[PDB]
Symmetry: C3
Subunit: 244 residues, 3 copies
C-alpha cells in the first residue's frame, strides 16, 4: 500500500480495502475532499479531479506537480538535525505566516506538518498557522512518497474550492468519492453534511456513481437513507454507495 507524504487527518488508512471493494470503475475519479490523497494514491484511474477547501494544501500540491525536483531538494534542507528544536520551529512558523511566496510557503508547510504537534493543520482567528512544536525524536523526510505523488499527479487537476463546485465537474465517465469531516460522535456544518447527501442523489439520477464514508450514527443513516448502506467494523464506519 502507497503512503501519503503528509500526516493528515484520516490518511484514510484501515479502510482502503473496503473503499476499493465498493468503489465503482470509470475513467475519472473526483474527490471533493482529497486531504492526504490516499485513495488517489492507491487506485488506477486514467485521470483524477482533486479538490479541497484548504488553499495551502492545494498550492503545495500544484507545486509538487509542476516543480518536482526543485521542491524536493529545497525541502530536504529543512530535515536536518539543526532544525529539530523550538527556536528553529517557531522561527519557521513566523516565516511561513509572513511569506507571500507560494514556493517557500510550501517548503515550510511540510516541515511544520512533520515537526509540529501531532502533525495537525490549524489556524488562529487571524488566519495564521498556530500549531505548536511537536517534540519528535526524528521526523521522517518523505522522499519516496513525494516522488510517487508527483508522478501520479501528472494525471490530476487540483482545485481549491467547495465540495459543491468540485462535484459539479463530475460527468458521464466520472466516479465520485467523498470523505467529509466526520459527523459529531468555520467548522463543517450539519447543513453541509446533508447538502452533500442531496448533491449525491442528484448525481446518481444522472448515472454518476457516488461513494461517501463517515461514522455510523443516527444522522449519517438519516442523510444517506437512499444509498445502499455498508457498515464496517473496526465507533463503526459507514460506507454509503449511490449506484445507477
Amino acid at each position: 500500500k502507497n503512503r501519503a507524504f503528509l500526516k493528515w487527518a484520516g490518511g484514510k488508512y484501515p479502510l482502503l480495502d473496503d473503499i476499493k471493494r465498493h468503489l465503482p470503475k470509470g475513467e475519472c475519479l473526483v474527490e471533493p475532499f482529497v486531504g492526504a490523497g490516499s485513495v488517489f494514491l492507491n487506485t488506477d484511474f486514467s485521470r483524477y479531479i482533486l479538490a479541497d477547501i484548504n488553499s495551502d494544501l492545494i498550492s503545495l500540491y500544484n507545486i509538487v506537480k509542476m516543480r518536482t525536483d526543485e521542491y524536493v531538494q529545497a525541502a530536504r534542507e529543512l530535515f536536518v538535525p539543526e532544525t529539530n528544536c523550538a527556536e528553529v520551529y517557531y522561527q519557521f512558523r513566523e516565516e511561513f505566516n509572513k511569506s507571500q511566496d507560494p514556493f517557500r510557503r510550501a517548503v515550510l508547510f511540510l516541515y511544520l506538518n512533520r515537526y509540529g504537534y501531532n502533525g495537525l493543520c490549524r489556524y488562529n482567528l487571524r488566519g495564521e498557522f498556530n500549531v505548536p512544536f511537536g517534540r519528535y525524536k526524528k521526523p521522517y523526510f518523505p522522499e519516496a512518497e513525494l516522488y510517487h505523488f508527483a508522478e501520479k499527479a501528472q494525471n490530476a487537476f487540483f482545485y481549491c474550492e467547495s465540495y459543491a463546485d468540485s462535484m459539479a465537474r463530475a460527468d458521464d465517465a466520472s466516479v465520485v468519492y467523498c470523505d467529509p469531516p466526520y459527523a459529531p460522535l468555520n467548522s463543517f456544518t450539519l447543513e453541509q453534511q446533508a447538502h452533500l447527501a442531496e448533491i449525491a442523489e442528484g448525481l446518481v439520477e444522472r448515472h454518476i456513481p457516488v461513494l461517501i464514508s463517515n461514522h455510523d450514527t443516527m444522522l449519517t443513516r438519516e442523510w444517506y437513507q437512499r444509498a445502499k448502506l455498508h457498515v464496517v467494523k473496526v465507533v463503526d464506519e459507514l460506507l454509503a454507495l449511490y449506484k445507477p
Copy 2:
C-alpha cells in the same frame, strides 16, 4: 422479570430489585415518568396511576388497554418479512407523521419502535418522528408482552401530563415512584429536577411516600438532601421520602 413490550430508554431492569427493596407499600402506585413500564409490570399494586409527557406513548397505552385483540391483530401485520427494508421503513415513518388517526398511529409506533435505530424515540424541530432505519436482522413481535401489559392495565389509568399534575393525584393510600430523565454527568431542565424534590417534600409531609431514582452526583445529593439516600453500583442513587 416480566418484560416491557417497548424498547424504551435504558434496558430498564438494572435496578428493579433495589427499587422493590426500598419501595414502600400501599393501595396505589403513581408513576409520573412511566416510560416503558418496568416497575408497573413487576409489582402487585391494587391500583396504578401512570403518566408521561409523551402523548404518542400514552395514547398507545390506552389503546392496548381498551382494544387489545383489535390492536394486536393490526400490529402483527406490520411484522411480516415484506416490511423489513429501508423502503418500507421510510414510507411507514412518513405515514405515521401524516396521520391523524390515533389507532393507525399506535399501530405504526410499534413498528417504528422495533425496526428503528437503537430503539430510539426522537422528534425533529418540526414535531416529526425522525429516527432512521435500524437495519435489524429479525425484530421480535412482542405479542406475549402485549397481552400481559393489557391484563395488568385493567387496574391502571393513563395520563398524558407533566409530573406536577400526576403527583397532585396521589393520596393517603398511594405511593410515588419517580424516574426523571437522568441528571447530567426542549430538554428536562435543572429547574425541573429541583422542582420534583420540592414536590416530594410536600407529599411526604402529607404522609404520602415517594422514591426517586437518579445518577449519584453533586446535584442529585443536593436536590434530594431531606430524603434517606442509598447508593448502588456509573453509580445510581435512591432517595426515599418516608413519613
Copy 3:
C-alpha cells in the same frame, strides 16, 4: 512526605519529586496559586509568599498561623460521631454561610472540607458555599498536619489577590512556582496566556519561574519560551521552566 491538612484540587502528591527536580534555589518561594500548600509544605525555603484568590482559604491560613492552639482545639470538637450526618452537615453549612466571624467560619470550613462531597470547595451564584454531604465512614482530623502547617507558616505571608499581584512581589532573591487551574483536557484562556506572559517578564528580570499544567496543544503554545519537560502518569502533565 508531608501532607496538606485540607483535601484540595491538586493536593499535588504524585508530581512532587518532579517539581523538586526542576524547581530552582533562592531565598524566597512565591506561590500565586498556593491552594493546599504541598510545595510550601515539602520544601525548605528560608521564606515564602503564599497567595490565592479564594478568601475563605487565606483567612483560614491566617487563623491557623496566628491562632494555632485556640483553632485546633475548637476544630477538633466538630470531628465527632454526632456530627457525621445530613441534619448536622446541613445545619453547619448554613451557619457557615450566615456567619460574619472569621474564626468560627474557619472552624466550620475545615469540617465542610472533610465531611463534604469529594472534598470539593464550590459556591453557587449567590456566593454561598454549596458542596453537599459526602457520607464518609469516619473523616480524619488532620491534627499533626495542622501543627506542621502552623510551625511552617512562621516563615510565610499569606495574601488574597490575583496571580498578577502576587507575582509582582517577587525580587532578585525569589523563585516562583505557578499551579494554575488546569487547561481544558472560571479561569479563562486569556488568563492562562497572561500568566505565561508575566513569566517571560520575570525571567528577563533574572527571576526564575516554574509552571505546571496538562500537556496539550495550548499549554505548549503558551509556554513556548520555556525548557519543557513532559512527565508521564489520564493525560501527561507538563512542567515549564523559565531559566535565566
